[PDB]
């Protein structure tokens, strides 16, 4: 939805909206994943059980962006050509139809394979991080 | 087709199935009273004015109440919360003495329920003992074997396990308790009022926390529950399977009034140095026995409405109700707690007669126990101390628990009987709308972008 | 190692009652339903009510609902079947069974030895 | 009207050949089959329709034709002869006796 | 070894190899430091004792990159001239021989001193974050 202040329960209705329109207001999830709502008894230990996993899940997602070269960017292009075997090369006609919740089932098996290629994009940078240009 | 290249989007709104421990949050300022409660934590403090909701358009999600992961999360944490509050309280080991019991006489009369038992109890000093007496207001004290004497009795704890008192400080209350999933996880909710317990739901909405679910404990009848929206709903795993439990939801309640009209007095017995035992000392009023009142017309209408709704699944078979089959006192009688007393009501007429559903004051005698083996079956023995004065209750029945007799009945008839004994099926009738799904920003999605040229920045695309 | 130890063969007259036992061992707690079945020779198998040993809830099945009564003993991990008013037709083998797993009990994978009961006029 | 009907009543076989037993049902529900030699507790053979029981040999198989169900046993050795019972949700079939020649 | 798909126990043979070969596949360590392979009893509390320190050490490392201007970059040049007192000015010839496990022994005393210069290097930039240029 247009407008990004909003609430986490103000944008998540994009889960059924078009996959193209859902790309707007993408920052609210990045805000919400941090802390959210959260003698010794059950709830006291739960505030250490759940809180620590919420942090560690966030760190696991961010460091993947850092390695891939997409640090700090919600949207991010990457130098990898889209293999037609993963999906047909016509999603530009289709993200107006599919929602993000529906796109995932297209690439369930291929997601872990694709992360290798995004890393391989970085070795096109890591190869070009020792040779010539930094004399500039 | 088009030339497309990989892109990264994370921050994306998509989820996956998962299960995790859930924080609790109590409604209003009840967290300030909750510190002195059991069936309630110490305490479930909210941080924001929960609950809040957003409707998700075009979203359909698959629900299932019988494989639900939240019900196991609550039951395995309520019973853990239950014995934590009971742990520091006085144990009743020194009361297992050869009780000498006789008729409990009262002012110009005698009471049938209970026995006047006397025993030797230790004083402050351990080498001296004194005679003491107390009216254990149940006849459920086992006579002692290996003797012809009929006047020697014994407290039923020590045959199997020693018990602990419920301290007067803590109060048994069904305070509404919300559950809030931690960050990174979102609780869905199915608004489809016609949901029968499983299958797709096409009116999903997300919430910060669950509604005000209260942890009431009872058998054969669900009290102070959340009513159905449109009409009566019946929910079971598979109705053809005569096992399982047929949880019913009423869309309008029937008020049950229960009372303990005797005027009892609490008495303090000094069993040890600091350890104190509370027992009913005497009756200071006329005796009238416990009972409950339920409207004849309103309940009779409930079985007529429920009967036709069942007959939709069981076509052309007249629905018959009947008395409970058997079991302990906890499940063969409608059991519940109210005001610190544990009732066990006979259901004198909440079973009887054919009710076809085609349209072609009920008084329940109730017993009371002090020692209770907790409802999950083999748990801690708890001695609930007496509550002085009269007790009166008013509660809304909202759902019935049933089970069916099979198989070779007459083909035009079917018999239904009450059920109970498992606390998870009480809470599974209220905690059925929800799921817990972990929010996973996904993998990639292609775009018409192009390979970044020598680390340069870029606007649109 | 969950198995059901059952006892024992006996003879009876008409009219008098009868009691059979069944112990569940190799099993952490009796938490799951426990059936009883009549394998009469020359007749189709007949079924008798389950027993949920947790709460003791019971569901007597056939026209035996006026005769059969069933109990249990949690601290001995034992279940009992008791049948009143033995007719001449009640001669059969009585099997204490359990399902494959506690989620669905109608696939009886575990059976007892079998307790033959004979009624002689 | 909930009845399970096994047919034929009895099978006479030379040991080592194939044999078939049916179980017609009048209601929607899962199915299972049992094997009883004289003087033992019946075994569990298959359940949930066609899936085989744990540790049972591979000679046994079944197919859900619809309201009719069929069991087919292939190259029956002498040890596997007995009496076969059908089952749904309680309701048992009349029993089919598999016998040697 | 060269390659990035690999395993954390696929590249650590570079612990003996040359610093040049070790400089590639520098991302696999950055992946492993996050989570790795991790009634109440001893292991239950250990999963809270060890896990929180694993997160804590990772933040302290990314804390220094975020200040030095090397945020999100595995390799990173910095505006500090190498003082010959720390080491001879011919390591460009030598690091085809030494492994990183052997290089650390040379800068063991000087590492805490060098971090001051890298901090000073950023504050040649931070001193230039108020005066003139960015009227735009």
TrEMBL record, chains A, E:
Residue ranges crossing the lipid bilayer per the database entry: 1-24
Cystine connections: 70-76
Protein localization: Virion membrane; Host cell membrane; Host endosome membrane
Span list, region Fusion peptide: 1-21
Spans annotated as Immunosuppression: 46-64
Topology in membrane: Single-pass type I membrane protein
Sugar attachment sites: 83
Coiled coil (UniProt feature): 105-136
Protein name listed in UniProt: Transmembrane protein gp41
Organism: Human immunodeficiency virus type 1
Covered range of the whole protein: 496 to 648 of 847
